Structure formats: structure tokens, C-alpha cells
Structure 1
Amino acid sequence: ASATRLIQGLRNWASGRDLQAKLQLRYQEISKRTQPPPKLPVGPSHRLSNNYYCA
């Protein structure tokens, strides 16, 4: 991302592709390393009635 536009143009010409649109080095677009806490759902057997295990 820090490449100058001359090197960027030479690089896009040599590859034949627009390389800045799809960079293989990751930057600020990726997820944060600290996330909010999850609240995971429970399955269908988490019920207080009609939940006999033999069924």
C-alpha cells in the first residue's frame, strides 16, 4: 500500500492486473483482534418441558 505510483504502475503493467484492488498483504480492512463478547444460542433440546430424552 505504501508503494509509489511509478512502482505501482510498473507493477500493474508487469503483472497485467490491477494489483492494488486485491492486495495479498492485509491492512486495516481485517477484523479487530479484540471483539465484543459472544452470546451463543442454545440447541433445540434446551427446553423445560416436552423434552424427554427417550423421545
Structure 2
Amino acid sequence: ASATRLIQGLRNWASGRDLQAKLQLRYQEISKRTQPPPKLPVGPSHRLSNNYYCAR
């Protein structure tokens, strides 16, 4: 990005792979930080009245 069309065409002509499309300089889809806080679910225990440690 931040380039004109002439050198863009020179890039896509020196390697005909459409380098403008994906270029490994991310601008947009950096993951937006300060995410919401998670609430972690608990799996096959905290199930009351049946979690017998003699069993498992």
C-alpha cells in the first residue's frame, strides 16, 4: 500500500501473482485489542451430587 499504480504494475509484472492483493503488511485485520473479558466454562465436573472421586 501507499504506492502509486506504476510501481504497482511493475511489482505485478515482475511476478504475475497479484502482489497488491495479499502482501504481508497488515493494516486492517490486526485483531482489535482490549477484547471483552471471557467467562470460562467448566467441563465434566462441578456437576454436583454425582462427582464421586471413587469413580473417576
Q: How far apart are the structure 2 equivalents of 1:38 and 1:22?
A: 32
RMSD: 1.1
Partner of 2:15: 15
- Mark the runs of 5 or more structure 1 residues left unpaired by the alignment: none
**Alignment TM-score, normalising by the size of structure 2:** 0.82
Identical aligned residues as a percent: 100
Distance 1:23 1:49 in 2: 56
Partner residue of 1:2? 2
How many Å apart are 1:16 and its aligned residue?
1.4
Distance 1:20 1:46 in 2: 52
> In 1, Cα distance between the equivalents of 2:9 and 2:53?
66
Q: How many aligned positions are there?
A: 55
What secondary structure sits across from 2:24 in the alignment?
Answer: coil
**How far is 1:46 from its partner?**
2.0
Aligned equivalents of 2:13 and 2:46: distance in 1?
59
